[PDB]
């Protein structure tokens, strides 16, 4: 599923991401935009053999099991395919665990490089929230 900007903002808010660990809603919408272009089916392979999955491009090395990343942890206790679902619950629930680990939203490369220090409120402007 390819979300609309405001439709994603409302689902993230419903799941409790607005101000989760001090990160306003605009940060999560910005990160989803640059990580997956709002597509729940997005996958990208890395050089180390790991794979990033879903709307928030959650990596198979630490967070999920895809059965092909040797010596990898499954810290969110889920199959990576659960992160490609049109329902974002698993992606949101796993993202809350990642953002809590100590590095905050810096775990998402595209957030650090394209959202961090910008006007992230613009990503929710015009939405009925
Ligand atoms: Na894994």
* CA 60 to ligand 1 centroid distance, Å: 4
**Top CATH class, 1-129:** mainly alpha
Distance 117 CA to ligand 1 centre (A): 31
Contact 78, 94 (CB under 8 A): yes
What is the rounded distance in angstroms from the CA atom of residue 22 to the CA atom of residue 1? 28
**Are the C-beta atoms of residues 49 and 28 closer than 8 Å to each other?**
no
Q: Is 101 annotated to bind ligand?
A: yes
Which letter does DSSP use for residue 53 in this model? E
Residues 6+ apart with CB under 8 A from 68: 49, 51, 60
Distance CA 109, CA 128 (A): 29
What is the DSSP code (8-state) at residue 86?
S
User: CB–CB of 100/89 below 8 Å?
Assistant: no
Q: 76 with 94: CB under 8 angstroms?
A: yes
DSSP per-residue string spanning 12-30: HHHTT-TTBTTB-HHHHHH
Q: Method used for this model?
A: X-ray
Q: How far apart are CA 96 and CA 48, in angstroms?
A: 24
Task: Using the Cα atoms of residue 71, residue 43, residue 58 and residue 109 in order, give the sign of their dihedral.
Answer: positive
For the chain, the 3-state helix, strand and coil shares in percent, each to the nearest 5, are 40, 10, 45
**CA–CA separation, 22 vs 36, rounded Å?**
23
Q: How many residues does the chain have?
A: 129
Residues facing residue 20 across a β-bridge: 23
Would you name the residues annotated as active-site residues?
35, 52
Nearest-angstrom CA–CA distance, 99 and 76: 12
């Amino acid at each position: 599923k390819v979300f609309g900007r405001c439709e994603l903002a409302a689902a993230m808010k419903r799941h409790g991401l607005d101000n989760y660990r001090g990160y306003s809603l605009g940060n999560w919408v910005c990160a989803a935009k640059f990580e997956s272009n709002f597509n729940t089916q997005a996958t990208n392979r890395n050089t180390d053999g790991s794979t990033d999955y879903g709307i928030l491009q959650i990596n198979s090395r630490w967070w999920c099991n895809d059965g092909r990343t040797p010596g990898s942890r499954n810290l969110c206790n889920i199959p990576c395919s659960a992160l490609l679902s049109s329902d974002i619950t698993a992606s949101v629930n796993c993202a809350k665990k990642i953002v809590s680990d100590g590095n905050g939203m810096n775990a998402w490369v595209a957030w650090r490089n394209r959202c961090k220090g910008t006007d992230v409120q613009a990503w929710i402007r015009g939405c009925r929230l």
